[PDB]
């Protein structure tokens, strides 16, 4: 028997809003700024530390460039494949998308950190030596496009 | 407005409720109607000066037209297919007034 009357917030979900400079009983005459000063009037810049050159100013820059033409992939773990494929078999980009391991559009790569014990046929783009050896030892195949 | 000159009206509220009277003039601009015998007042006039009694206007909504049967009644309207004139209707009986 709950009406619109019987609606209550969670305990502690509501914290009281502080009214600053609303009487000397709680917060008075200074509003949490204390005594006189520029912090008592407006503010201080974040990058300003008293006139001396800041830590973002007396430090060298990092060398080298960012390589705007970088090609990006996403690793898929052999152990994760083994866990998600107890039965095993052929695996492809659509299958991995359905399994939700990588983004649908993104391009995939695999590595052999985990262990494989189920025959899995892997279709991918870039293969590493460890994943290749794991696939070969698990009695399966893995072809790269 | 269905409360027109020459009609007979019955007072609903006020000290003169339940009394019958005859309408004299109507003020559509302020929707106030003047009926003799109701809203008794006293006026002091000095030119030859004395106490004189005149009729105080009453708001039109406080009266209803009484029918020929002696019963106050709402007013409806009908359309005559002969000429196209509009005649008022006593709602309780449907007769024309």
């Amino acid at each position: 028997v709950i009406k619109l009357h019987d609606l209550k917030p969670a305990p502690g979900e509501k914290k009281a809003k502080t009214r600053v400079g609303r009487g000397e009983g709680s917060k008075g005459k200074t509003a949490g700024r204390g005594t006189k000063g520029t912090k008592a009037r407006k503010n201080v810049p974040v990058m300003f530390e008293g006139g001396q050159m800041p830590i973002h100013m007396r430090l060298p820059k990092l060398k080298g460039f960012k390589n705007r033409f970088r090609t990006e992939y996403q690793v898929v773990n052999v152990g994760d494949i083994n866990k998600a494929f107890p039965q095993g078999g052929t695996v492809g980009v659509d299958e991995l998308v359905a399994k939700g391991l990588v983004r649908k559009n993104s391009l995939v790569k695999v590595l052999g950190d985990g262990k494989l014990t189920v025959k899995v046929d892997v279709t991918a783009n870039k293969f590493s030596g460890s994943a290749r050896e794991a696939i070969t030892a698990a009695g399966g195949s893995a072809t790269e496009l | 407005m269905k409360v027109h000159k020459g009609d007979t009206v019955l007072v609903i509220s006020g000290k003169d409720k339940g009394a019958k009277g005859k309408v004299l003039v109507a003020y559509p601009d302020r929707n106030k109607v003047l009926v003799e015998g109701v809203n008794r007042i006293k006026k002091h006039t000095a030119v030859s000066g004395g106490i004189v009694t005149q009729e105080a206007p009453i708001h039109v909504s406080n009266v209803m037209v009484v029918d020929s049967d002696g019963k106050p009644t709402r007013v409806g309207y009908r359309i005559d297919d002969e000429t196209g004139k509009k005649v008022r209707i006593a709602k309780t009986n449907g007769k024309d007034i």
């Binding site: 028997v1 009406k3 619109l4 209550k8 917030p9 | -």
Partner: protein, 209 residues
């Protein structure tokens, strides 16, 4: 797992309706439903109100008088917040309070409210409210009076049914909502909730799909 006898205006039972547990048997969540209803009212409210600040009032952009020699207190503008008839210190602006609530939040809150409703046994089945091609508010009033005695009743009617909605519109303590327009605020507001057969079927199918 609950069953309700469908009822007819003639007073005869039509069939049976099965209610799944996973939709109407969840434990109530007072905090969640409170948050959702608060967001509902926050969205309902319109944020149209404004005042004029010191920079928007008319005229008085020049110094009232000289600094020294006047003898009175120092002032800078005729329209300062200290002055009467001047601007306001912090003036409100036209604004909105739309609060986005996640779909699981709203769905879970509605499901909790409906589960509590089914627990309190205020859900019913009606094949049709009034006779077709004849809107009659009096017939609907008599039907609802016979069916229940609570002050407020909520009825869910399909969109294509117009006569029932038109007949039931005028009465004040009763409210009508299409099954696609059901919301937690109206669920909580009314005392009794009634489902039409088509509306309940559509709602259940949409939930299960």
């Amino acid at each position: 797992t609950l069953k309700v006898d469908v009822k007819t205006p003639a007073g005869k039972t039509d069939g049976s309706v099965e209610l799944p547990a996973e939709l109407f048997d969840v434990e109530p969540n007072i905090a969640l439903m409170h948050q959702v209803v608060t967001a509902q009212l926050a969205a309902k409210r319109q944020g149209t109100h404004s005042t004029k600040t010191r920079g928007e009032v008319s005229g008085g952009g020049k110094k009232p008088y000289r600094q020294k020699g006047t003898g009175r207190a120092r002032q800078g503008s005729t329209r300062a917040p200290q002055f009467t008839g001047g601007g306001t210190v912090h003036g409100p602006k036209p604004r909105d309070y739309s609060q986005r609530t996640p779909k699981k939040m709203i769905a879970a809150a509605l499901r909790g409210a409906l589960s509590d409703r089914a627990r309190n046994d205020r859900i019913h089945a009606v094949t049709e409210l009034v006779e077709g091609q004849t809107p009659s508010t009096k017939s609907a009033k008599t039907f609802l009076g016979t069916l229940t005695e609570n002050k407020k009743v909520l009825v869910v009617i399909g969109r294509t049914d117009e006569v029932g909605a038109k007949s039931v519109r005028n009465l004040p303590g009763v409210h009508v909502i299409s099954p696609d327009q059901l919301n937690t605020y109206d669920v909580l507001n009314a005392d009794d909730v009634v489902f039409s057969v088509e509306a309940l079927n559509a709602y259940i199918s949409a939930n299960s799909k």
